């Protein structure tokens, strides 16, 4: 019969930082205090091979806090990225080259999640169709996040990548946002919300936060709460300065 298989290791890998006004983590706050938020990628060691979740910020952000000057989000988003935080350099320091990866999973195509996608020209890049179409046609997305000739593996809805690695369709923060539900050998069930909730309070208290469609984001939180009720996972949020204070990071794993 079937026996649940698990991921060997889940690593949390810091991939630079990004400043956002605090009203992006709580839409009720009056703008004027920036927060220096973590940017994450995740590396999964699986029986099938290594899987990278998200790819950090684009090269244009390197030593360029002013990347969004001149744009509709000038002053609202300030990347904090050095040369060391380029995904290929991160990967090389951990022990991989792009072609070693089995899959890339793009949670969504915001610049802090897909800015490194162009480095992976052979690995299949798993992305929701509604996210891909949004980035193709909407000028809010950076071109770096929707390069045309990458090996996209477009999916629709929930999806099993390999045994132990699940994608949960969680639109709202972006049109085709997806979260991850992972079963690891050391820890059991893990929910990576990604940006379906920037912080614990966005999830527990349903505090509104930056996103394309807040009403959808709330329904995706409600779905994730159903999952949580059934699976009781450990939960990690997308851009949570408080939670970062307790998160085990590379070279530790869960």
Ligand X SMILES: CCCCCC(=O)N[C@@H](CCO)C(=O)O
3-state secondary structure of 128: strand
Would you call 79 exposed, middle or buried from its count of C-beta atoms within 10 A (0-12, 13-18, 19+)? buried
> Contact with ligand X (CB under 6 A): which of 74, 100, 140, 242?
140
Q: Which is nearer to ligand X, 20 or 91 (CB)?
A: 20
Residue 239 is assigned to a ligand binding site = yes
Per CB under 6 A, 61 contacts ligand X: no
Q: Which is nearer to ligand X, 3 or 28 (CB)?
A: 28
Per CB under 6 A, 20 contacts ligand X: yes
Per CB under 6 A, 197 contacts ligand X: no
Contacts of 73 (CB under 8 A, 6+ apart): none
3-state secondary structure of 95: coil
Q: Which is nearer to Zn ion, 21 or 195 (CB)?
A: 195
First to last CA, the chain: 27
Residue 85 is assigned to a ligand binding site = no
- Where does this chain touch Zn ion (CB under 5 A) — which range of 57-65, 79-87, 106-114, 130-138? 106-114
Place of tokens 């979740």: 53
Per CB under 5 A, 86 contacts Zn ion: no
The phi, psi pair for 176, rounded to 5°, reads -130, 35
Residue 22 is assigned to a ligand binding site = no
Q: Which two tokens stand for residue 119?
A: 């480095």
Nearest residue to ligand X, using CB? 110
> Contact with ligand X (CB under 6 A): which of 27, 36, 73, 222?
73
Per CB under 5 A, 240 contacts Zn ion: no
Site for ligand X in 207-226 (CB under 6 A): 210
d(CA 222, CA 51): 28
Please answer whether residues 184 and 11 qualify as being in contact, where contact means their C-beta atoms are separated by less than 8 angstroms: no
Question: Which helix (H) or strand (E) element contains residue 103?
Answer: strand 103-105
Per CB under 6 A, 106 contacts ligand X: no
Per CB under 6 A, 136 contacts ligand X: no
Residue 177 is assigned to a ligand binding site = no
HSE-up (13 A, CA, CB side) for residue 242: 7
> Contact with ligand X (CB under 6 A): which of 110, 116, 134, 168?
110
Q: How many residues does the chain have?
A: 254
> Contact with ligand X (CB under 6 A): which of 111, 132, 181, 236?
111
Q: Contact residues for Zn ion (CB under 5 A)?
A: 110, 112, 195
Q: Contact residues for ligand X (CB under 6 A)?
A: 20, 24, 73, 76-77, 110-111, 140-142, 210
């Amino acid at each position: 019969g079937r026996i649940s298989m698990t991921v060997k290791k889940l690593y949390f890998i810091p991939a630079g930082r990004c400043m956002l006004d605090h009203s992006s983590v709580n839409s009720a706050l009056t703008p004027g205090k920036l927060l220096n938020l973590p940017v994450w990628c995740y590396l999964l060691e699986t029986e099938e091979g290594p899987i990278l979740v998200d790819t950090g910020m684009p090269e244009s952000a390197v030593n360029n806090e002013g990347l969004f000057n001149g744009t509709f989000v000038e002053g609202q988003i300030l990347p904090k990225m050095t040369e060391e935080d380029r995904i290929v350099n991160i990967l090389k320091r951990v022990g991989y080259e792009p072609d070693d990866l089995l899959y890339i999973i793009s949670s969504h195509l915001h610049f802090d999640h897909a800015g490194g996608n162009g480095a992976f020209t052979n690995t299949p890049i798993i992305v929701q169709r509604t996210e891909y179409e949004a980035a193709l046609h909407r000028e809010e997305y950076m071109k770096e996040c929707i390069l045309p000739h990458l090996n996209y593996k477009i999916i629709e809805g929930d999806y099993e990548v390999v045994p132990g690695v699940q994608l949960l369709y969680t639109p709202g923060h972006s049109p085709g946002h997806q979260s991850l539900f992972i079963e690891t050998e050391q820890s059991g069930s893990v929910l990576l919300t990604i940006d379906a909730s920037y912080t614990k309070e966005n999830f527990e208290d349903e505090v509104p936060f930056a996103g394309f469609d807040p009403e959808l984001a709330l329904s995706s939180i409600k779905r994730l709460k159903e999952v949580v009720k059934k699976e009781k996972p450990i939960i990690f949020f997308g851009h949570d300065i408080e939670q970062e204070k307790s998160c085990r990071v590379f070279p530790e794993y869960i």
